[model samples]
Target: KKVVLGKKGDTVELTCTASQKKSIQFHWKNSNQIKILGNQGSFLTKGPSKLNDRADSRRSLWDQGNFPLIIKNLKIEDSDTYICEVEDQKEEVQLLVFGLTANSDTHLLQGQSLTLTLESPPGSSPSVQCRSPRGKNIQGGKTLSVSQLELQDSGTWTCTVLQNQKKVEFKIDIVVLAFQKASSIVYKKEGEQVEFSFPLAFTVEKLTGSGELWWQAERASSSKSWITFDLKNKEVSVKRVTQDPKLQMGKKLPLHLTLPQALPQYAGSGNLTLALEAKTGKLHQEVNLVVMRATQLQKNLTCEVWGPTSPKLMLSLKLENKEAKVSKREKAVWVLNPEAGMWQCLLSDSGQVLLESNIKVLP
Candidate 1:
C-alpha cells in the first residue's frame, strides 16, 4: 500500500500497471467498495461510474499505458482508500487531504495571541514546524500558539508539515501594530523644550489626508487651535496659533515632534491624531501640558522663578524698600525698570513667604 498526501484544491494521480501488457484489464474502486472506473480489453470507460456526483465529476481515468486515475480539485472529503485492480494484481493507495485555519484574523495588535491549527485526516499523525518572519525556527507541534505578539512578529510566517514521509508547507501573513498611547501628561518649565517620539514602524507617508500630521490644542481658557506639519513639503502651517514647532525624521526612527520653547499658551490639553492607511485604522495620542512660570528681565538685572499659579500663591520681586507683584495671567513677568540694588524673588503662600532668592544687579 502507498500513502499519498494531497493539499486541498490540488490534483493527484493513482497508477496501476499490469504484469502482462499485451491484453490488460483495469478496474478502480473507492473506499465504499463501489466501482468508479474500469477498462475491459481494448475498450475503455469515459469517466468514473456508480460514484457520487462530486467524485464522478472530478475523477477521470487516464490511458498512459499504466492506466492512472486522475483526481482534480481535491477536497478534504476526498481523503479515502483507493483500490486499483489490473488482471490478477492489485494496487492500494491511501489519500490524505489536509488544510489549515487560524482561530482569529491574521492581522492583530501588539500583545495579542494567535492560534493556528492543521486539519488532517484521522490516523494521519502530521507534525508541524513554524518559522518566524525572519526565517528563524519558532516552534514545532500539531498546533502553533503565539502569545504577546510584537512588532517583529509582522510578516509572513511559514508552517511546514510532515506526514507519512511527505512534506507540505503553508504561508500565513501576520501584521502586528504598535503606536503611541491614548493619553499622557507632560510638564515643562517656561523656555524649555518638549518632544514627542514615535515608534520605528510609523511614518508620515503612511498616514491619510495628504500624509500630514494634525495637532489640535485646547487651552485652559476653553479656546482651541489647529496646526499641521507637512514633512514631505517641509512646511509647518498653523491656524489660530502662534508658536514654532519642528519635525524631526531619521532613517532608523519614523518621526518625532519638538517644541522649541514651551509657553503658557501651550499649557493645556491637546491631541495628535493620525489616520493610518494601513491595517490600523486610526491612532490618537492626547497630552496635557503644564508650564511653570519664569521671570524675564534685562541683561543688567535677571531673576527667574517657576511655580504653580494660584490665587493663594503670590510671587513678587522686591528691591530694598520697593516691591513689585508678578502677573498671573501668563505665568511669567517682565521687569521694565532696572534696579542696581539687591533684587529678590519672594514666593509667598497665604500671606507668608515660602521661598526667596536674592541677586545683586550692576551699576
Candidate 2:
C-alpha cells in the first residue's frame, strides 16, 4: 500500500508493477469497486468508472510488466483508493487530492475577517500549519481564521499540511488595504517643512492598471493641483493649477512627499489616492491641512518701540553701524533683506541711551 498526494489541476501517476514477465494481465479498480481498466482475454477494456472516462487515454500502457495509471487535471473527486490486480496479487494506492478555499474574497479591506480552510480527502486527519508573508507561524489547524486584517497581513500566506506522512503545501495571496476613504487632519506652521509618509503593506506589483499614486491638493480658495507618481513605470509628473517649487516627491514603497517650506497657499484639504483597480477598490486618503501663521521671525526681524511712554521715547535702527530708516508713527523698523551683519535697535531718552538690543544675523 502507498499514499500519493496531489494538488488540484495537477497530474499524478500511480505506479503498479507485476512480477510476471510474459503475457501478464493487469486490472485497475477505483474506490467505488468499479473496473476502470482491465484486460479481458487478449483485448483491453476501459471504463465503467468515471475516473476512466476522465482519464481520456492519458493512462499508461503495460510495458515490460510495469503498468502506471496517469490522471490529468486532477479534481477533488479523484481522491480515491486505486487497486491494481495482477493475477491474485493486489496493490493499493491511496490518492489524496487537496485544495485550499477561502470564506471570502482574497482581496479585503482592513478590519475585515477571512477564514481559509483546507479541503483534503475524507477521514484523513492532516496536521495543518499556516505562516504569514514574513514567514511567521500564525495558525495551526484545518482552518485559519483571521480578523481585523492589517496592512502587514497583505501578502502570500503559506499553508502546509502533513497527512499519511506526506507533506503538501498550499499558498493563498491576500491583499489588505487601509487608506481607502480615510481622512486625517494635519497642522503645520507656515515656512516650516512638511512631510507626508505612507507606509504601504503591499508591493506596487500587486496593484493593477499601471499602479499610479496620485496626490491632489484642493486649497481653501477652491484651486486644485495634482502630483502623480507611476509606480509601475517609475515616473513622476505634476499638473499644477499654480506652480509651487517647494513641492517634492519621494520613495516608491513607502510613498513620501515633502514641502520644503509650507506656505499658506499650499494649505487646505488634500487627497492621496492609489489606483489599485482591485476588489477592495481604489484607495483614497484625505488630509485636512491647516497652515498656521508663523509667530516668530524666521529670516527677517521687526524692531518695534511702543509702550505707554512711546511718544516721549526716541527709537533708531542701525544696520552694520549705519543708521537705517525708522518709521515714527509706526515706531517700528522692518528688515526685509537681511545680510550677514549686526542689527542694532537703540532707544534714547534725550541723547541718553536708555535701551539697546543687538541681533547678529547669519548668512
Candidate 3:
C-alpha cells in the first residue's frame, strides 16, 4: 500500500512494476472495484469508466509488463483509495488532496471575535489545534469560534493531520491593537511632501495587526487609500502607484497631495485633516514686501554687497518687465540710475505675478 498527496487540477501517477509477463494480468480499480485501467499479456487498454479520457495505462510499458497508472485533470472528488490488483496481490494506494491557498490566518482589533475553519479529503481524519503567542492550547473544532478576543491571543494557530503516514500542518497568525483615540488638524503648503508620525504609543499598538487607511474628498462619493501599513505582515503597501520622478509642467506652483496617528497605544487616535494652502500666491496679495527704493545714490555706486546678506538689501527694481541694473559707490553705498518709468521688485518666486504691493514701481 502507498500514500499519495496531490493538489487539485494536478496529474498523479502510480507505479505498478511486475516480474511475470504472461503469468498474471494487472488491473487498476478505485473503491467499489470501479475499473480505471487494465492490461493483459503484452496488451494495454483503459476501462470505459466515466474517466474515459482522464485515466490511461502505459502501453509501451505493457510490452515490458510494467503498466503504471496515470490520472489526469485530478479533481477534489477524485480523492479515494485506489487498488492495483493482480492474480494474488494488491497495492493499497490512498490519494489525499488539498487546496493551494494563503487564506489561513485571521487578524482583528481588541474586543473582536474570529472563526477558524478548514476542509479535508473524504474519509480523512484531520485535527485543528490553535495556540496563543504564549504557546498555550486554544479550544475549538474544524470550525473554531473565537469570541471576545484579547491582546494575549496574538500569535500562531496550527491545524494538523496524519496523511500518507506523514503529519501535515496548517498555520495562522493573529494580532490585536489596543489603545485610545484623539484628533488634530494639519495645514501644509502646496508643493510639499508632508508626513505625520502618529504617537508611538498608539502607532506601535497596531504594528502587530492589519489595518487600512482611506481618504475621502469633500462632498464626493468616491474614496481612495494610497498608503497602507499591514500589521500582520509587518510591512507597508501602496496601491496603483503613479509617480513623477521629475515633476510635470504646470502654470501654478506645483502642489502635491496632503497627507497622518496614535498609543495600550492606538493606531489612529483621531480625525486628521491635512489641508494644502495656496498661500504663496495669496501672501503676495495681502502683504507689503519691498522696502523704500530709489532714495538717492552716487554716480558710481560701489556697493560691496556685504549688506546684501539681508533680505532688505536683496531688492531688485524692474523697468518694462525687465530688471534694471544697479551698482554701488562705496563698501556700503548702493547706486541706482534713477530711471523715470515705474520700478518694481519681485516679492516671491511662488506667486503668479510676484507682486501685491509686495513692492511697486507700478506700470
Candidate 4:
C-alpha cells in the first residue's frame, strides 16, 4: 500500500489493494520495521475494523473481483505497507499493494506518403515498374504511365527513366515496353517416331492472338546438327537439334510433333529428335530438342533419363508394320493388339515371357 499524492499528516485519504485473497492485520510499517509508524488497530474505534472503516473510504481494491479499497481521515502515521493478509489453516499470505507512477516501455508516433521524382537523365527514354512480392509483373498504362505521370503512378517504382532518351525526348534504345515472356511444355514417344502428347494444361502469359508454329526433328544419333523453322511464314528448315528444343511461339506457345514409325527389322533401338519455333504478330519462341531416346530392342530394357528429361511413353503410338520379327524356321502367328512401347515375347503355351521385343502388327 502507498499514499498516492499527499505529504506527511496531509489529512488526505490514500488507497491500496491486497494482492492475496484476504486482508492482513491492519498495522503501521516503515523503512525500518523497528521504527514503524503506530499500528492503526491501536487507538482506533475499538479494534481492527476502525482502521478498515477509515482507510476503506480512500483505497480501492481491484483486478480480480471487486477489491476497491477506500481510505479517508488520513493520519501522518497512517503511511505504511498496507498489506492485505489472508489467514489460512497453514500460513498467511500477504499482498503489498503499490501506487502506480508511470509505465517505462511505451511511446507514440504517425504516417504520410513521400514522393520521389525520378527522371531519366534527359534524352534517355526510361520507364518505371512496380511489382508485389508475388512474382507478378505490373505494367503502367490506363491510370498510370505510357508517358505522362499521374496520381495513380504511385508505388514502389523501379524507374528506368530512359537514361539515354535522346534530344528528341522520345528516343528508343535497348528498352522494351513489356516484360519478357515465359512458356514451356513436355511430351513423350513410344514405337513410332517417339511422339508424346502435351496436354493443353500450360498457359502463356504473353500477349495472345493468332500465332503459327513450325517444327522439325533430329534423331538422338544425329543431334549434332540443328533444325530451324519460321512459323510466322509457315516455313521449316532442318538442322541437328543438338539439344532439347521446342516450338515456343515467342517462348509462349506449345508445339506438337508426329514422327514416322520404326521398321520392325531395325526396331531394336530408335530415338526421336525435335526442335521447334512459334511465330505470331507479337512473340516468337526458339527452342531446340535435347538428345532423348525412346526405345529398347529387348524385353526388360529399363528406360532411364539422366537429367531433366521426360520418361513418358504413350499407349497407342505404334511401331512400323515393317518392324515384324521374321524367320524361315519359325511360323508367325498374327495377333491383334500388341502392347505399346515394347512387346513381351513369350513361349506359346506356358504364358511365361521368353524375352522382350519391340514389335508391330501388320496394319
**Candidate with better TM-score, 3 vs 4:** 3
In model 2, the Cα lDDT at residue 15 comes to 80
What does candidate 1's lDDT look like per residue over 1-363, in tens digits?
A: 778887788777776666554445667787777676666655555444433333321123333347677777777777888888777767888888777667767336666577878888877777777788975586656787787776677888887777877777878788766564655655565566777565425434433321233444333343434444333323233322333344333323344556667765565556565443434444455655555543435553334334234456655665655757343323334565655767666555567654455656666
- Model 4, stretches more than 4 Å misplaced? 1-129, 132-222, 233-255, 262-363
Query: What are the candidates' C-alpha RMSDs?
Result: 11.3, 12.6, 18.3, 24.9
Off by over 4 Å in 2: 21-23, 40-44, 56-61, 109-111, 148-155, 176-189, 192-363
Per-candidate TM-score against the hidden true structure: 0.52, 0.55, 0.38, 0.22
Best by TM-score, which number?
2
Model 4 score (lDDT): 0.28
**CA lDDT, candidate 4, residue 161:** 19
- Measured by TM-score, how close is model 2 to the native structure? 0.55
Cα deviation at 195, candidate 3, in Å, is 4.9
Q: Model 1 compared with the native: what TM-score?
A: 0.52
Residue-wise lDDT of candidate 2 within 1-363, one digit each (tens)? Answer: 689988888888888776774456777788777877776545667786877655532223554666567788898888889888777888999999888768788457666687878887777867667777875686656777777676677788887777877888888888786663355654454455878765544544443522333334432343445565555434333333324445676544555667787665565556676655455455566665444331216777666543222356666655645556452433455666566666666665567754455666668
The deviation in Å at residue 65 for candidate 1 is 2.2
RMSD of 3: 18.3
